[PDB]
Ligand binder design. Structure first.
Ligand SMILES: [Mg+2]
Ligand SMILES: [Mg+2]
Length: 94
């Protein structure tokens, strides 16, 4: 089930503004986060916006959500998370 599998994902930083707005939408406050915190609020955002497939809860259908605009994706799988990590490398600054 979604948060269970989300928690299994592999990977202090100031998110760029498009990502920051997504994190604030998920209940995050301020601008300075650990990667652990960033991943946690991304999961919370995905859960409150119900972007995951009820049937296939590793699939996130993020298209025509600002998260899909940010990722440049219609979708990603938590089983093949490379596109999320591509966006995180572009959108977290030390
Ligand atoms: Mg702060
Ligand atoms: Mg979590």
């Amino acid at each position: 089930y979604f948060q269970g599998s989300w928690k299994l994902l592999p990977e202090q930083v100031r998110p760029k503004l498009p990502l920051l707005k997504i994190l604030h939408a998920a209940g995050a406050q301020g601008e300075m986060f650990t990667v652990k915190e960033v991943m946690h609020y991304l999961g919370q955002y995905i859960m409150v916006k119900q972007l995951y497939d009820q049937q296939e809860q590793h699939m996130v259908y993020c298209g025509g959500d600002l998260l899909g605009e940010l990722l440049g994706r219609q979708s990603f799988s938590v089983k093949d998370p490379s596109p999320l990590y591509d966006m995180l490398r572009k959108n977290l600054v030390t």
